[PDB]
């Protein structure tokens, strides 16, 4: 991922003189240049998977910090949730802006001013984008058809293309309501990532309205089984990535499929 970030920064930013690895540049280097330090990979649950941390340390020639502010804005614009393709690994990803280093540091011996922008990448180990949860597949298909954005089913994938929407399942309950009938209730949460927050609001609004008005969803294209909505609720404050905004509870009833043998031939005999 170093190659991808370096290539993106060089291509999109022209004030940049170079983008190096951590302890590469010597004192003859021409400023401003950037340094791509790769942080931890931590497990952050089922929805995010392993999350990697990246820092893009900017360096500048100690003229004035306003140059560094402009360069930081440029870097954040270039990398924030814009999908990047790493030609070396031939595997894409999408950096998420996360913050900035502790203070704006001055380094006198190098005669430079440095600031560290802080990114991250989601779901490093996930490489499939497929799910055996038929309900999640059905709702992701429904969201894609209704909304004309990507849908990623079980968990985030590292090269997600904003705007998008995940449809993970958070909780499952099964009941045998009868001798022949079983009830399956799933609480399915949905995310809507996007750079533009008002776009998130619009997408969630139309998704909720579609879920209410069309109160049920084709589980498959055979039309046999439908999911039927129970309650759809949006918590807008909730985190865009870890938690997800929309919470929908779907249920579905199925019949036990006992096809026993048939009384094809019958016979009876008499006495007194």
């Amino acid at each position: 991922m170093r190659a991808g970030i370096r290539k993106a920064l060089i291509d999109n930013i022209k004030e940049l003189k170079g983008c190096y690895e951590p302890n590469v540049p010597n004192k003859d280097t021409k400023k401003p240049y950037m340094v791509v330090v790769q942080g931890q990979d931590n497990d952050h649950g089922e929805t995010i998977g392993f999350e990697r941390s990246i820092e893009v340390w900017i360096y500048e020639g100690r003229t004035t910090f306003k140059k560094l502010d402009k360069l930081t804005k440029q870097v954040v614009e270039v990398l924030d949730m814009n999908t990047i393709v790493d030609e070396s690994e031939n595997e894409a990803f999408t950096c998420i802006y996360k913050g900035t280093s502790e203070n704006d540091i001055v380094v006198e011996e190098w005669d430079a001013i440095a600031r560290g922008i802080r990114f991250s990448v989601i779901a490093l180990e996930d490489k499939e984008d497929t799910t055996n949860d038929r309900w999640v597949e059905a709702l992701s298909r429904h969201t894609k058809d209704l909304l004309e954005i990507e849908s990623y089913k079980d968990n985030w994938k590292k090269n997600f293309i904003a705007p998008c929407a995940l449809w993970r399942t958070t909780h499952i309950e099964n009941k045998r309501i009868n001798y022949h009938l079983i009830e399956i209730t799933k609480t399915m949460k949905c995310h809507v990532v996007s750079k533009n927050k008002d776009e998130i609001v619009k997408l969630l609004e139309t998704l909720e309205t579609s879920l209410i008005i069309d109160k049920r969803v084709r589980l498959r294209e055979d039309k046999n089984m439908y999911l039927t909505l129970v309650s759809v609720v949006e918590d807008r404050e909730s985190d865009m990535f870890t938690t997800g905004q929309l919470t929908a509870v779907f249920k579905m009833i199925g019949k036990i499929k006992r096809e026993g043998p048939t009384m094809d031939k019958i016979y009876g005999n008499g006495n007194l």
Binding site: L181, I182, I253, K255
Partner: protein, 130 residues
Amino acid sequence: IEEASFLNGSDVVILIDGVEELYMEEIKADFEQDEQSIKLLGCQNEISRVGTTKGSFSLNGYKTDSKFAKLGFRSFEIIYNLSNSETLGYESIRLKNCRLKKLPLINSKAGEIVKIEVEGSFRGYDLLNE
């Protein structure tokens, strides 16, 4: 586990007197019959017969107009379409000669939505579709 389908109660469409009714929440209707229990003179177990029938019905919903107060005790029809979306086999019932037992002129609490409740009786029913 082959598919099965309950009938969700929000699929109901109630046509009161030929004009669709949008604000009804619940509808109830039964067809009574006087049991006419007969204790035979020799047989120990009771015997019952069909007797004479009598329809009763009830409605609840949100008040949107004074349709029912205008309607009075007039005779009017109710048609009730319960669609099954998963199979499209809507069960349609028609009630004949419904008559309000009481006009719900006023029923309103201060802090809540003004709901309307109706009950009455209907002479007979037609199972239009099933």
